[PDB]
Amino acid sequence: NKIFISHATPEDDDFTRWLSLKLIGLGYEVWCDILFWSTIEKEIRENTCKFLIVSSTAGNKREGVLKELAVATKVKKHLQDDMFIIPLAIDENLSYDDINIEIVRLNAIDFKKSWAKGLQDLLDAFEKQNVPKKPPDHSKSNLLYQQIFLHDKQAIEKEETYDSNWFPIISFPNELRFHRYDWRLPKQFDVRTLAFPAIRYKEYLCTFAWEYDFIHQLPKTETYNGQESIRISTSDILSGRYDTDFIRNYECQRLIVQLINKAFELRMKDKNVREYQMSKTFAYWIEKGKLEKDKFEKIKLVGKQKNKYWHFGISAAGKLYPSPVLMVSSHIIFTMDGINLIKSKSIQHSSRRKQGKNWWNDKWREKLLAFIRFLSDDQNAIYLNVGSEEKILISNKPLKFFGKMSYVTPS
Amino acid sequence: MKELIYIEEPSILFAHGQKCTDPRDGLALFGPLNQIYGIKSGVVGTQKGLQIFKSYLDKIQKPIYNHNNITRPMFPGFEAVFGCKWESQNIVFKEITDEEIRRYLFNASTHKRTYDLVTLFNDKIITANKNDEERVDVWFVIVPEEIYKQFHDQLKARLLEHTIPTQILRESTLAWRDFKNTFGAPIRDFSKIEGHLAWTISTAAYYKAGGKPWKLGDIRPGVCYLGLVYKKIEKSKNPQNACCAAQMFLDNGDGTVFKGEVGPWYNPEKGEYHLKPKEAKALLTQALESYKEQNKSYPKEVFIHARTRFNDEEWNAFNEVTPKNTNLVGVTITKSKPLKLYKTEGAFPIMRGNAYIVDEKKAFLWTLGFVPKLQSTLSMEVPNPIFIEINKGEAEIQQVLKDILALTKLNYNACIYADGEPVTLRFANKIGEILTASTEIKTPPLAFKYYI
RNA sequence: UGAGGUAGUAGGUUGUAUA
DNA sequence: TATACAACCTACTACCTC
Numbered sequence: 001n002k003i004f005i006s007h008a009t010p011e012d013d014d015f016t017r018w019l020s021l022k023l024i025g026l027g028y029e030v031w032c033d034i035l036f037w038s039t040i041e042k043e044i045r046e047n048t049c050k051f052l053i054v055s056s057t058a059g060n061k062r063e064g065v066l067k068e069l070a071v072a073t074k075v076k077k078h079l080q081d082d083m084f085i086i087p088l089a090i091d092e093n094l095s096y097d098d099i100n101i102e103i104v105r106l107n108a109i110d111f112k113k114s115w116a117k118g119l120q121d122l123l124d125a126f127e128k129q130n131v132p133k134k135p136p137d138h139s140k141s142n143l144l145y146q147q148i149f150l151h152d153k154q155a156i157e158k159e160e161t162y163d164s165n166w167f168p169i170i171s172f173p174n175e176l177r178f179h180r181y182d183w184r185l186p187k188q189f190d191v192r193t194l195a196f197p198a199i200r201y202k203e204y205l206c207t208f209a210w211e212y213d214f215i216h217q218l219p220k221t222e223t224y225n226g227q228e229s230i231r232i233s234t235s236d237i238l239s240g241r242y243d244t245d246f247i248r249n250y251e252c253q254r255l256i257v258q259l260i261n262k263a264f265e266l267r268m269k270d271k272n273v274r275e276y277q278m279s280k281t282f283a284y285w286i287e288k289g290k291l292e293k294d295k296f297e298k299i300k301l302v303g304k305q306k307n308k309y310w311h312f313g314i315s316a317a318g319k320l321y322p323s324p325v326l327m328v329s330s331h332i333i334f335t336m337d338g339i340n341l342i343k344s345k346s347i348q349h350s351s352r353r354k355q356g357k358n359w360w361n362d363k364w365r366e367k368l369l370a371f372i373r374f375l376s377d378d379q380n381a382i383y384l385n386v387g388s389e390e391k392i393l394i395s396n397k398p399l400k401f402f403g404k405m406s407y408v409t410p411s
Numbered sequence: 412m413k414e415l416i417y418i419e420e421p422s423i424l425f426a427h428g429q430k431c432t433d434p435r436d437g438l439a440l441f442g443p444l445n446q447i448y449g450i451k452s453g454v455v456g457t458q459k460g461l462q463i464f465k466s467y468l469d470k471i472q473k474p475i476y477n478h479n480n481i482t483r484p485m486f487p488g489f490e491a492v493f494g495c496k497w498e499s500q501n502i503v504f505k506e507i508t509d510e511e512i513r514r515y516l517f518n519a520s521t522h523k524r525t526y527d528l529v530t531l532f533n534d535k536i537i538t539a540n541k542n543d544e545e546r547v548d549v550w551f552v553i554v555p556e557e558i559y560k561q562f563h564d565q566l567k568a569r570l571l572e573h574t575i576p577t578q579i580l581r582e583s584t585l586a587w588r589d590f591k592n593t594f595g596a597p598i599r600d601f602s603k604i605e606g607h608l609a610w611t612i613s614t615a616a617y618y619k620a621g622g623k624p625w626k627l628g629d630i631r632p633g634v635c636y637l638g639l640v641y642k643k644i645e646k647s648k649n650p651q652n653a654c655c656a657a658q659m660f661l662d663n664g665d666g667t668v669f670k671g672e673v674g675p676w677y678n679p680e681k682g683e684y685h686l687k688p689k690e691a692k693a694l695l696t697q698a699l700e701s702y703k704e705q706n707k708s709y710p711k712e713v714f715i716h717a718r719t720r721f722n723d724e725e726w727n728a729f730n731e732v733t734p735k736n737t738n739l740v741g742v743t744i745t746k747s748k749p750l751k752l753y754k755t756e757g758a759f760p761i762m763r764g765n766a767y768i769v770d771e772k773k774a775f776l777w778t779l780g781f782v783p784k785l786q787s788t789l790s791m792e793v794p795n796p797i798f799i800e801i802n803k804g805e806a807e808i809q810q811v812l813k814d815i816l817a818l819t820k821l822n823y824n825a826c827i828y829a830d831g832e833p834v835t836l837r838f839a840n841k842i843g844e845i846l847t848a849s850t851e852i853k854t855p856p857l858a859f860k861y862y863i
Numbered sequence: 864u865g866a867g868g869u870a871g872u873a874g875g876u877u878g879u880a881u882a
Numbered sequence: 883t884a885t886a887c888a889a890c891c892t893a894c895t896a897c898c899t900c
């Protein structure tokens with residue numbers, strides 16, 4: 001009550017899977033080498049009902065199909081049935097006059113033009129010759145597809161740890177100050193271009209400091225410290241009810257993140273990195289002369305793209321809702337000589353998209369981590385001198401994630 | 412260390428009541444759900460366009476193989492897959508002479524050249540539609556190489572005026588080997604992906620001809636799904652902001668309904684990506700009546716999602732028009748918030764389906780990533796996650812995330828594994844793009860065949 | 864426009880606090 | 883009506899295709 005299909009192993013495979021699953025769907029027990037040597041010879045003799053042979057240029061000379069054909073011919077000469085072998089023509093470069101012996105005298109089915117017509121005529125032939133069947137069970141042709149072809153392609157209960165780019169802030173300055181500094185700061189002076197992070201926010205009581213000593217820029221040194229207001233950076237966050245009529249607790253955090261994003265920008269001006277301008281942010285990259293062999297800790301941060309040189313650059317931005325973090329984003333900045341930037345803005349897009357195609361998870365991870373570690377002064381932190389005595393500290397090690405479902409990596 | 416939960420991938424229902432995950436793999440084994448007897452085609456292009464189209468339509472009648480049949484499954488052939496007959500002999504042809512094209516594209520203008528070409532093609536199509544006996548289901552506009560170098564949206568809107576399905580096919584797509592250019596290499600070689608092009612074209616043609624490729628099965632009965640997208644019609648006089656919607660509710664039993672909810676409701680302001688009370692009331696009433704006409708009952712929950720926040724001025728109107736015990740939930744789906752998760756060991760990215768729950772109202776869904784079945788990445792470099800927030804209403808975050816994956820699994824325009832955002836938003840954006848270029852269309856059709 | 868994705872370049876609105 | 887700043891919103895172009 002079986003059906004035997006013979007085919008080449010490396011070629012003429014997809015047709016065999018399609019045909020086998022289609023015939024299983026309608027209720028025809030098929031015995032193919034894909035689904036699962038003496039067993040083959042026993043199934044051709046004592047079990048099979050119709051022996052189908054696939055004809056192709058790749059086939060027609062393979063040893064295994066020829067041996068199976070010979071056994072099938074011997075069984076046919078005993079079973080007294082002239083329709084035991086039904087060739088299927090699934091090629092278009094092999095003539096009908098080049099078919100090997102023992103099958104050359106049998107009319108084929110010509111799956112060449114279209115597979116649906118071949119399947120329809122095959123089913124009509126089976127119905128005409130009274131091949132046994134069971135009611136269509138379309139579930140089984142899905143079950144075997146999942147079991148055999150999708151065995152190794154699933155989700156395993158495997159544990160991995162994921163890195164991130166959210167570098168957290170270990171410690172904050174203790175006090176946020178609200179200095180008055182009336183008539184000692186001209187109404188025309190920009191609060192920017194000043195050595196320390198400051199902004200004129202809130203109804204006077206301006207020049208948000210985090211530290212004193214804006215001297216040699218605004219020489220008045222005639223301030224009564226009593227009028228200055230001081231808040232706690234612990235209640236300014238965590239909704240510690242720092243919300244007052246002076247400033248509510250929502251504006252205060254939006255006010256601190258500004259100081260963080262200014263402190264980063266003014267700290268990077270003191271390192272060995274230069275700057276690049278983007279649409280809405282700044283990017284920092286290392287020159288060619290710095291760093292030995294262009295590699296910091298065995299990770300390369302500058303190389304060559306034909307006549308150009310490529311540099312790795314990062315940006316940053318504060319955030320305070322989940323935890324105080326510093327979101328770092330990666331960039332590639334292209335130059336010409338290695339120290340002189342390219343003033344195109346039209347070829348740098350076409351070079352970024354060219355270079356980023358060979359870079360995957362590993363390269364991005366190592367270059368980002370190496371660039372972050374290059375800036376750090378302390379072993380486990382990087383120093384933002386917001387003040388002459390206080391500072392903001394960001395961790396060298398980004399936040400880590402972990403999961404419980406995963407996959408087996410390809411070889 | 413923070414733990415990421417996993418959302419099991421949804422399953423789509425093919426013919427015979429069987430489930431699968433990859434449409435390319437489920438259509439071959441089982442096939443589409445409905446029976447359309449055949450697709451009678453129609454071509455509007457040059458005679459060489461007709462030759463190219465007939466050559467391609469004869470080529471796709473037999474199996475086509477990709478380079479990698481695990482990442483990109485092979486194509487059995489149109490009749491083997493869909494059980495239909497889309498032949499290269501029952502083809503209605505309406506010719507466009509090269510003289511007309513040269514006359515209409517020689518110098519003219521830009522907005523005049525595009526308008527003239529659209530008038531020519533639409534005149535041919537509409538004339539063939541109204542005064543002729545032969546029936547054409549899908550019209551295939553074979554666009555020469557010199558025409559595509561704005562036209563597509565105009566064509567689709569001015570045909571939307573008469574509700575005629577259409578499909579634009581440039582000659583470079585179907586004859587990529589001939590258009591060599593460069594120094595001897597094709598501008599876009601399809602040699603390794605020739606089994607994906609056939610899949611996508613065939614599924615688009617089948618859907619646009621009244622066919623139903625697949626359907627969703629794992630979604631909550633009763634609840635609706637509206638997706639609002641705002642487009643800037645401000646390019647013309649009287650700057651405004653048009654809003655478009657799309658509904659995905661389930662039939663009274665064993666069915667899926669996926670249409671549009673249009674009639675775009677404008678906003679006179681400049682940066683106000685929001686809606687007025689009356690327009691919000693009209694939109695909700697129209698959607699609710701659309702659901703009730705089919706299911707003969709009112710919904711149990713309305714699931715509104717968009718790319719923007721919902722203010723308290725529209726939600727009050729929404730609650731004012733909602734009857735009985737129909738709850739409402741507002742969800743906002745941002746796309747490019749900067750959080751990238753790497754893998755500590757390996758050169759392959761994070762698996763798709765991982766969700767990082769920040770708060771009970773926020774989460775980080777991962778739609779792009781590494782698919783074990785395809786053994787490849789759905790994106791390039793390190794994938795970016797979408798951000799899901801339950802803005803207004805009360806609901807569980809995990810149910811919302813499951814629904815987002817379910818919506819992601821419903822792209823009919825292309826035959827792929829999945830997308831990176833719910834398909835309702837994308838189709839609403841397509842509808843808005845089509846309607847912006849039009850000129851005051853009243854009561855547009857609600858079917859995606861005319862737009863997509 | 865067979866499709867999907869990744870980036871860059873431009874703008875705009877709100878919310879304070881100033882003019 | 884205008885300078886500076888965080889937080890969101892859109893709309894184009896241009897290059898890759900695993």
Ligand SMILES: [Mg+2]
Binds near residue numbers: 615824863
């Ligand atoms: Mg389309």
